[PDB]
Structures are given as structure tokens and as C-alpha cells.
Amino acid sequence: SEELLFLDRETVRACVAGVDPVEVVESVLRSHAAGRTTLPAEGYLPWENDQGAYCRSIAMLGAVDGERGPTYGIKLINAAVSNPSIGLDRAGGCGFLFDPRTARPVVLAEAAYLSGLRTAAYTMASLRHLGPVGFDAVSFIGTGAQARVHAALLARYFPAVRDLHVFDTERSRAEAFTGAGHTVHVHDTAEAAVRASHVLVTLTTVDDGYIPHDWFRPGSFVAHVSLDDLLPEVFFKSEALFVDDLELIRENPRRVLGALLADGDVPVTGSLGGVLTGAVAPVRPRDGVVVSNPFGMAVLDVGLLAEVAAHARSAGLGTTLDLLGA
Amino acid sequence: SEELLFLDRETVRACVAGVDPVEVVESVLRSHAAGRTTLPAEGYLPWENDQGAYCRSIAMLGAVDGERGPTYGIKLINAAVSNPSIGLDRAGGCGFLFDPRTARPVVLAEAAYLSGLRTAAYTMASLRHLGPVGFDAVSFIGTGAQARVHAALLARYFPAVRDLHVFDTERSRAEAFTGASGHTVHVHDTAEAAVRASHVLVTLTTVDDGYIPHDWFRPGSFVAHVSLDDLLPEVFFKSEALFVDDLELIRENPRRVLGALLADGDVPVTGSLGGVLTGAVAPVRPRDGVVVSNPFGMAVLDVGLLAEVAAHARSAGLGTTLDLLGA
Numbered sequence: 001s002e003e004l005l006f007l008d009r010e011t012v013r014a015c016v017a018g019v020d021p022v023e024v025v026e027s028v029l030r031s032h033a034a035g036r037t038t039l040p041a042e043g044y045l046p047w048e049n050d051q052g053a054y055c056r057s058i059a060m061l062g063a064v065d066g067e068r069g070p071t072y073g074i075k076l077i078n079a080a081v082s083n084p085s086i087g088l089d090r091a092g093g094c095g096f097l098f099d100p101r102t103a104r105p106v107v108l109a110e111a112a113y114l115s116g117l118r119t120a121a122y123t124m125a126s127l128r129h130l131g132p133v134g135f136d137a138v139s140f141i142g143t144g145a146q147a148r149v150h151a152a153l154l155a156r157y158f159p160a161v162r163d164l165h166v167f168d169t170e171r172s173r174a175e176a177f178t179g180a181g182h183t184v185h186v187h188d189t190a191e192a193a194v195r196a197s198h199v200l201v202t203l204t205t206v207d208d209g210y211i212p213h214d215w216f217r218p219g220s221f222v223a224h225v226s227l228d229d230l231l232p233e234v235f236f237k238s239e240a241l242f243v244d245d246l247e248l249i250r251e252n253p254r255r256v257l258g259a260l261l262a263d264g265d266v267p268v269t270g271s272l273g274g275v276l277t278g279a280v281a282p283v284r285p286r287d288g289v290v291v292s293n294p295f296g297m298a299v300l301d302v303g304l305l306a307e308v309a310a311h312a313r314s315a316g317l318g319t320t321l322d323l324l325g326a
Numbered sequence: 327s328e329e330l331l332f333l334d335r336e337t338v339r340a341c342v343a344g345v346d347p348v349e350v351v352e353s354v355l356r357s358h359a360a361g362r363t364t365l366p367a368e369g370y371l372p373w374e375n376d377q378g379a380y381c382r383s384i385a386m387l388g389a390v391d392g393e394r395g396p397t398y399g400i401k402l403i404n405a406a407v408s409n410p411s412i413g414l415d416r417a418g419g420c421g422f423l424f425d426p427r428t429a430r431p432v433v434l435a436e437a438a439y440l441s442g443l444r445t446a447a448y449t450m451a452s453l454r455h456l457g458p459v460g461f462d463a464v465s466f467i468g469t470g471a472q473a474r475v476h477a478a479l480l481a482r483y484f485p486a487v488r489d490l491h492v493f494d495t496e497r498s499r500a501e502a503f504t505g506a507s508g509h510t511v512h513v514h515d516t517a518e519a520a521v522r523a524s525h526v527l528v529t530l531t532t533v534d535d536g537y538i539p540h541d542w543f544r545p546g547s548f549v550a551h552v553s554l555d556d557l558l559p560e561v562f563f564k565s566e567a568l569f570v571d572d573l574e575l576i577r578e579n580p581r582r583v584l585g586a587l588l589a590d591g592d593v594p595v596t597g598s599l600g601g602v603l604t605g606a607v608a609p610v611r612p613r614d615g616v617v618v619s620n621p622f623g624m625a626v627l628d629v630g631l632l633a634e635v636a637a638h639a640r641s642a643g644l645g646t647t648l649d650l651l652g653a
């Protein structure tokens with residue numbers, strides 16, 4: 001017999017709520033730092049749809065020789081730039097886990113939600129080890145899906161956070177944002193949002209940089225999720241600069257940090273992985289801004305899908321698909 | 327909502343019986359010869375299970391801007407060496423098609439049988455244009471999953487084939503092999519005896535080292551080199567003709583003998599089967615020597631067939647609808 005455990009988005013939600021996604025991110029980062037992950041070359045299939053818009057499929061294979069035991073899988077994310085014009089999320093797709101003995105795909109999960117959850121989980125990990133201690137306010141620029149999942153994980157992992165300071169170039173999206181026990185303060189300008197707290201998360205789809213060093217308080221932190229908001233000078237004047245994977249960043253020079261690396265020396269303190277193993281000393285904000293620039297590692301999604309499937313099995317959630325069908 | 331049409335193995339089987347898979351392959355090969363496909367580098371994740379057996383996942387993307395509109399998809403095929411030991415087929419996996427407009431996966435299928443079907447359909451195309459005319463016997467080295475699907479298509483496309491000459495290292499597998507109802511199976515005791523018994527060979531093993539010399543082949547012989555490492559280098563060099571699926575694909579995989587030989591120096595490559603179908607190269611049928619067919623395997627053929635199978639399943643009302651969100 002040949003069976004798939006199919007986990008829909010709502011099942012994956014319920015599994016995430018029942019595990020510690022931040023603990024999982026920390027465990028995979030420590031495995032990655034010790035050379036116990038395999039990240040092969042990605043499958044990339046670009047094309048142009050009937051509209052004339054950029055479409056792609058990205059196939060991201062991943063293995064984690066983890067503390068618990070070995071995990072193997074794939075993250076398949078497809079995107080069309082024209083999707084939001086017709087009322088769809090830009091990206092969608094699916095993840096599989098493989099049986100370590102047979103190599104068979106045994107788990108199939110909707111992946112777009114889990115992808116956003118992983119990004120948010122990494123932010124919480126970064127804040128725990130590199131952020132100010134006891135911060136009670138977080139600032140967002142961009143207030144869509146990614147802001148909602150960030151707010152949810154703030155309630156789980158940072159209960160001192162009572163106030164969210166938000167700005168969105170789409171005013172109506174900002175005024176609709178509620179959070180997850182949070183009071184929301186709408187700001188008229190990005191600057192006013194940044195100045196209102198010690199912790200910024202950028203969640204835009206911007207190509208052009210606009211955030212200077214001067215906006216940040218002494219003793220500040222920025223999670224650079226959207227990757228093109230910060231001006232070159234923020235990186236060079238940073239009290240510290242932490243990445244997820246320096247090679248991933250160098251391989252994507254279309255994002256500002258990758259571009260700066262190509263121009264010469266950039267003061268990268270180290271990786272979040274290296275902090276967690278004790279390879280690099282942690283630097284928390286004191287006199288300046290600490291910058292976190294993660295590109296996003298597929299091994300984290302594979303690791304999170306492994307923990308989600310383990311919870312799904314133990315609580316008997318999901319639906320088993322017969323691949324043969326007699 | 328975000329919905330998947332799901333096609334299990336036996337549904338794929340049912341659809342294939344009602345379309346022309348060799349015609350689909352031929353169309354996609356002409357689309358690819360014209361440069362109206364996209365065949366990215368295949369993703370590769372290797373590892374070693376606790377038994378110390380070689381394991382792998384292969385993610386193979388493909389696009390076809392062909393004679394049935396633009397089609398996009400992927401084929402995920404995973405294998406463990408140790409699977410036949412514990413009583414499982416060597417290879418298993420799944421395939422997707424993506425919406426041309428939104429890029430969303432809209433079809434999910436079991437793929438190991440589809441993969442076998444595509445391979446056998448390429449063999450049938452190669453024999454039709456490059457094989458002897460009127461052959462009534464075919465030889466197989468290896469009687470696994472590929473051998474069963476090859477037998478089924480021989481019944482559809484070359485009904486004058488009444489005799490199958492087989493050899494397998496596990497004689498128990500060779501004794502269990504029946505082919506289709508129109509076939510008499512002759513079991514031979516060595517590889518050599520199977521080869522010499524006819525003018526048409528299909529190698530369907532898992533070897534990584536060559537063992538077949540030129541001397542075994544009758545004058546006016548054909549070989550479909552599906553297992554890709556059976557033929558010794560001299561077979562290529564002495565060949566009456568040599569046809570490939572895609573030369574650059576082969577060049578980039580020197581793990582397989584023809585890739586190794588091309589890196590080393592000159593090899594007398596006649597052209598591609600795609601080239602024959604478009605008229606870019608002349609066909610050469612066997613006469614005095616052995617015509618060699620060496621296809622590495624192209625994901626665009628899987629994507630092409632899965633689109634034809636999905637279209638048929640809709641009009642037939644087969645397959646089940648899955649919801650990816652769940653509400």
C-alpha cells in the first residue's frame with residue numbers, strides 16, 4: 001500500500017498551536033550551524049502568463065540530521081505577480097516529508113501558511129537572544145498576513161508586549177489591523193512608527209530603500225523580514241549585524257544586503273545559529289541598532305513540517321490518501 | 327478556495343487506456359526540438375538509511391508551450407536500493423500541474439506508474455521510426471516495473487511481437503513475468519542468451535557498470551538503453567547509428583557511460599529522436615550493425631502526459647477533489 005497523510009492549512013494551524021515552533025527553529029539552526037543540514041540547488045521554473053506577468057515554481061529540497069533524529073522533505077512555493085490583481089495571495093504551494101528508509105513521500109501539507117509561521121518563528125528566536133530584554137512595544141511597517149502571524153507569536157513568546165505601533169502605505173489596511181492582548185496605534189508616517197518603540201519588523205513588498213540610521217533609538221533592534229527597507233548606512237552603522245545564512249544572502253544580490261556584500265566588506269557580526277551554539281557572542285542593543293537580516297531557510301519549513309506531522313499523528317489529525325486506489 | 331484534482335495510480339491507468347501516450351510523447355519531443363519547452367536542472371537530495379542503503383529524492387520541473395497550450399508541472403521521484411528487499415517497488419512519488427495564470431498546483435497524481443508509462447512510450451516512438459520493420463520478438467534484461475509497462479505498450483503499438491526473451495539476476499522475478507495476453511515469455515539463463523535471441527533489446531536493470539559487448543548483437547539490431555549503464559563503450563563507438571533524447575542533458579550526467587564518453591572526447595552521435603520527428607536529422611533503421619537509443623529521461627514528457635491524463639479524467643469524471651485550506 002502507498003499512503004499520504006494530507007494536512008490542509010487549518011490542520012497545520014491546529015498542529016502549530018499545539019507545538020513550540022520557536023524551539024523547533026532554534027533546534028534546526030543549531031543543526032545547520034554544526035553542518036548537520038543538506039540544502040541542494042533549488043529547482044527554478046520561470047515563465048510569463050497570458051497577462052504578461054512574472055510566474056515561477058521554486059522546488060526547495062532539505063535534510064536535517066537533527067538532535068531528535070533525521071528528517072528529509074521538500075518545500076514547493078509557486079508565485080504569480082498578477083495574483084493580487086485578481087484577489088489571490090502572491091504565493092501558494094505544498095511541502096512533503098520523506099520516509100528515511102523507503103524515501104517515499106508520506107506527508108503532504110499546504111505550505112504558504114507554514115512559510116509565514118516559520119518567518120515569524122525566526123523573528124521571535126532573534127528577539128529572545130539578540131533583542132532588548134523586557135521590551136513592551138513592537139513597531140510594524142506593513143499590516144497584512146505576515147503582521148497578523150507576528151502579533152500571534154508575540155502573545156505566545158513576549159507577553160510584556162502590550163502596544164503595537166503600525167504604518168502601512170495602504171492606510172485602510174493599517175486601520176483594519178487588530179493584533180492578538182495588544183493595543184494598536186496607527187501612525188501617519190513610517191518614521192513615527194519606527195521612533196515609537198525599540199523593536200521594528202519590516203513586512204513590505206518594497207524595492208526602494210527608505211529607512212535611515214537616524215530613525216532608530218539608542219538600544220534598538222530591527223527584524224528586516226522584507227529585506228529592502230533599510231538604507232545601506234543602517235548596515236554600516238549597525239551596533240551588530242546578524243544573518244541566518246551568509247551564503248544564501250550573497251547568492252541573492254537583488255536584495256540590498258547581498259548587493260552591499262558584492263561591493264566589498266560589510267560588518268557582519270555572525271549568524272543566529274552561531275549565537276545559539278556559542279560560536280559567536282550575542283550582542284543585545286545598548287548604544288545603537290542591532291540589525292537582523294534573514295533571507296529565509298527552507299530547512300526550517302522541513303523541520304517545522306516534521307514537528308507538525310508528529311503532532312497530527314499523535315492527535316490523529318489529517319486525512320490518509322490511498323495513492324494506488326485498488 | 328484552493329482545490330486539487332487527485333489522481334491515484336489505478337485512475338492514471340484507466341485514463342492512459344483511453345488516450346494515445348506515444349502520440350503525446352512525439353508531440354512534446356517536436357515542441358522540445360523547436361525550443362518550445364523549459365527543462366531546468368533536476369533537484370537532487372541523496373542520503374543513506376540506517377540499513378546503509380542509498381536513498382534519493384529527485385525534483386524534476388518541466389514546461390511545454392506545445393500543441394495543447396502552455397503546461398507547467400513537476401515530477402517528484404524517490405527511490406531506496408533496499409525497497410525490493412522489504413517487498414516494496416524501488417521507486418515511488420507524486421506529480422503536480424500548475425495553473426498557467428496563478429502558478430498554483432491544481433492537479434496531484436501518483437507518478438511512479440506515469441514515469442514508467444512515459445519511458446515505455448518513448449521506447450515505442452524510438453522503435454516506430456528507428457527500429458527494424460516487422461520485428462516479432464523483443465528481449466528484456468530485467469523484469470521489474472519498467473518491464474511490465476513496456477510489455478503492455480508493445481501489445482498496443484507492435485502487436486506482431488508475440489515472443490519476449492527475458493533474463494533477470496533474480497530468476498524468481500523472471501519466472502513470474504507474464505507480459506500481456508498476446509505474449510509468450512521465453513526465460514533465458516544468461517544476459518548473452520536473451521540478447522542473441524532477437525533483433526530488439528531493452529535494458530531495464532539498475533547496474534552502474536557495463537557488461538554488454540558489441541559481439542552479442544545480431545546484424546540489423548536495435549537497443550533501447552533505458553538503464554543507461556549496461557552497454558560497454560565499444561557498442562557506442564561501433565554503432566550503425568546513435569540517437570539521444572537531449573545531448574546537453576546527457577553531457578551534464580557523466581555518472582552514466584555516454585556522459586563519460588562525451589567528456590573524454592568524440593562520440594558518433596547521429597542526433598535526437600526529436601530531430602528525426604522534425605526532420606532536422608534523417609532516421610537510420612538497423613541493417614548491418616546495431617542502432618543505439620540512449621534517452622536520459624526528460625521531465626517535460628511526464629508533464630506533457632500528466633496534462634493529457636488530467637484532461638481525460640475531467641471529461642471521464644475520474645479522480646477526487648481535495649481542499650488545501652479546509653476552513
Ligand SMILES: NC(=O)c1ccc[n+]([C@@H]2O[C@H](COP(=O)([O-])OP(=O)(O)OC[C@H]3O[C@@H](n4cnc5c(N)ncnc54)[C@H](O)[C@@H]3O)[C@@H](O)[C@H]2O)c1
Nearest residue numbers: 416468469470471472494495530531532552553621622623
Ligand atoms: N531513462 C529514463 O527516463 C528512466 C526512467 C525510469 C526508469 N529508468 C531506469 O530503469 C531502471 C528502473 O527499472 P524499474 O523501475 O523496473 O526497476 P525495478 O527495481 O522495479 O526493476 C529492476 C529489475 O532489474 C533486475 N536487475 C538488476 N540488476 C540486474 C542485472 N545486472 N541483470 C539483470 N537484471 C538485473 C532486478 O532484479 C529487478 O527485477 C533504473 O535503472 C531506472 O533509473 C530510466
